[PDB]
């Protein structure tokens, strides 16, 4: 069924992550449910999040890969495209999703989001304002939150 189709796609991507592991990223099933994953992202070197470890939840819908996976942060982070609930604003997770894309590509796209936010279409307007107009303050506060919650 639809559930059955998603299951084998999930397993395929899981084996591909084993053969070709992502750099500074890892992901896998929480328990024995293949539709519910847990992921980690190291703070990118070219970002004020460097040194921190950020955990994410990944839930695969039953219509995967025809519908995008649902990804959210569990670790708190100071970002204009990520709110206090861990919700993420990213095109690849919605309007620009494609079945040809993978979880590996999603995690890489999130990594880039941490290095270069999209302030013009933000999730947290106040943080976006600081990013655009006072980059030093943005970097300063980002590092502080990294120290407090990502260590």
């Amino acid at each position: 069924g639809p559930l059955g189709s998603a299951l084998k796609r999930i397993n395929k991507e899981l084996s591909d992550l084993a053969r070709d592991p992502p750099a500074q990223c890892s992901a896998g099933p929480v328990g024995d449910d293949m539709f519910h994953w847990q992921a980690t992202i190291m703070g990118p070197n070219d970002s004020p999040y460097q040194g921190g470890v950020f955990f994410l939840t990944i839930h695969f819908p039953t219509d995967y890969p025809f519908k995008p996976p649902k990804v959210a942060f569990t670790t708190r982070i100071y970002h204009p495209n990520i709110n206090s609930n861990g919700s993420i604003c990213l095109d690849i997770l919605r309007s620009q999703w494609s079945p040809a894309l993978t979880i590996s590509k999603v995690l890489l796209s999130i990594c880039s989001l941490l290095c270069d936010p999209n302030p013009d279409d933000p999730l947290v307007p106040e943080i976006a304002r600081i990013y655009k107009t006072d980059r030093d303050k943005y970097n300063r506060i980002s590092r502080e939150w990294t120290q407090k919650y990502a260590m």
């Binding site: 604003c89 919605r94 304002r129």
Partner: protein
Amino acid sequence: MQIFVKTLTGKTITLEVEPSDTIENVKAKIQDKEGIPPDQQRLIFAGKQLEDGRTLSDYNIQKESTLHLVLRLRGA
């Protein structure tokens, strides 16, 4: 005339306005103090979403009134 604008973070904004000022004008004033563009602004008062094109007197907003500033999301 002096009104107040409360944010989700708890910050209270103090604005100097006139009864004939449109909601768009008010959003411009908020941009002057907070730097947040009008299209990312969403104003709530008397249980209603204040629409751009109407004045403060249209909603009968008077002195010492407190507006609620919330998020206006555009695809994310």
